[PDB]
C-alpha cells in the first residue's frame, strides 16, 4: 500500500530479473516487510561454498532507513556479533536509499573475502585473523559446514 511497500517490490523485481550471483532473497508471501535471504561464500575465500541464511526486518522508513539484518546461520567473522548483527560501513554510516536488497546482500558477501578487523565485532575472529591464520581458516570451515544444515 505505502511507497515503502512498492519500493520493496522494486527490489524483489531486481532479485528475479537480475538476481546477483550467489544470493537469494524473498519476503514472506504475506509480510513483505520481512525477507528471507541467503548468501553463498565465494571461491578462494575461506568462506567458500557456504550457504548462510539471513533475516531482514523492514519498517515504513524504507528506503530511507536500512533494515535490520542478521545471519541466522552460525557465523565466525570479525564484523559479526554473536547475535548475527553486522558491522558494515554502508549499513551504519554510509547508507544511501538507492541501495536495494541485491546490493546489500552482495555488499555483505564482499566482507567474507575482504574482512575488516578495523571495526571488529567478534574479538576472536579478528584475533586469529592476525595470529593463527591457519586456525582461523579451520574455524571458518566449521562455520561453512554447519551452514549446510
Amino acid at each position: 500500500s505505502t511507497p515503502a511497500r512498492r519500493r520493496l517490490m522494486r527490489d524483489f523485481k531486481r532479485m528475479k530479473e537480475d538476481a546477483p550471483p550467489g544470493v537469494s532473497a524473498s519476503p514472506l508471501p504475506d509480510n513483505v516487510m520481512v525477507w528471507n535471504a541467503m548468501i553463498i561464500g565465494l571461491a578462494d575465500t575461506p568462506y567458500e561454498d557456504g550457504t548462510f541464511r539471513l533475516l531482514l526486518e523492514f519498517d515504513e522508513e524504507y528506503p530511507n532507513k536500512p533494515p535490520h539484518v542478521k545471519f541466522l546461520s552460525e557465523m565466525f567473522h570479525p564484523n559479526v556479533y554473536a547475535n548475527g548483527e553486522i558491522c558494515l560501513d554502508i549499513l551504519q554510516n554510509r547508507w544511501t536509499p538507492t541501495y536495494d536488497v541485491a546490493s546489500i546482500l552482495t555488499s555483505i558477501q564482499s566482507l567474507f573475502n575482504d574482512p575488516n578487523p578495523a571495526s571488529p565485532a567478534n574479538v576472536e575472529a579478528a584475533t586469529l585473523f592476525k595470529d593463527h591464520k591457519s586456525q582461523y581458516v579451520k574455524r571458518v570451515k566449521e562455520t561453512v559446514e554447519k551452514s549446510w544444515e
Binding site: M15, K16, E17, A19, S24, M38, D49, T51, E145, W148
Partner: protein
C-alpha cells in the same frame, strides 16, 4: 532452474549436496594419501628392523670377542651385558664400548687422544647416519605421495 530464474528451494539443496561431495572427496583423497604414507612407513619399519636385528647380531659377535681380552672386571661385564643383544644397552654405553674396541682391537698421551677423537668420529657418524636414514625415508614419502596424487589428477584429465 534456468540461470535467469530466482534460485529455488530445490536448487539450493542441490548445490549443498555437490558442495558436500566436494568436501567428502577432499577428505577421502587426503585420507588415502595418508594411507599411502602409512603403508610406506610400515614397509620402512620392517626393513630397518631387519637390518637392525642383523647388525646387532654382528655387535653381539664383536662384544663376545673383545670380552676374551678384557683386563678389568667392569670391562668384562660391559662386554657380556652388551653381548646379550639388548638393543638399548648399546646406545646407553656406545661411547664406552667404542673406547673398548679402540683399546683392545689394536695390537702415552697420543694413544688416549686418538681414543677421544675416534669416539667423536663415531658420534658424528651416528648423527650423519640418523640424518641419512631420515632423509631417505622422507624422499621415499615424497615419491609415494607424488605418485598418488598425479594418478588422481590424470584420471580427471582422461575425463577430458
Amino acid at each position: 532452474s534456468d540461470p535467469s530464474e530466482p534460485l529455488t528451494q530445490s536448487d539450493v539443496i542441490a548445490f549443498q549436496k555437490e558442495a558436500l561431495f566436494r568436501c567428502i572427496n577432499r577428505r577421502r583423497v587426503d585420507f588415502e594419501a595418508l594411507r599411502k604414507q602409512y603403508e610406506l612407513s610400515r614397509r620402512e619399519c620392517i626393513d630397518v628392523s631387519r637390518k637392525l636385528a642383523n647388525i646387532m647380531a654382528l655387535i653381539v659377535t664383536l662384544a663376545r670377542f673383545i670380552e676374551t681380552f678384557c683386563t678389568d672386571a667392569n670391562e668384562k661385564q660391559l662386554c657380556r651385558e652388551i653381548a646379550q643383544g639388548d638393543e638399548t644397552l648399546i646406545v646407553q654405553r656406545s661411547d664406552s664400548f667404542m673406547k673398548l674396541l679402540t683399546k683392545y682391537g689394536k695390537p702415552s698421551n697420543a694413544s688416549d687422544h686418538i681414543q677421544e677423537l675416534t669416539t667423536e668420529l663415531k658420534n658424528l657418524r651416528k648423527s650423519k647416519e640418523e640424518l641419512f636414514y631420515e632423509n631417505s625415508q622422507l624422499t621415499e614419502e615424497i615419491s609415494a605421495l607424488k605418485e598418488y596424487y598425479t594418478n588422481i589428477i590424470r584420471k580427471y584429465d582422461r575425463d577430458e
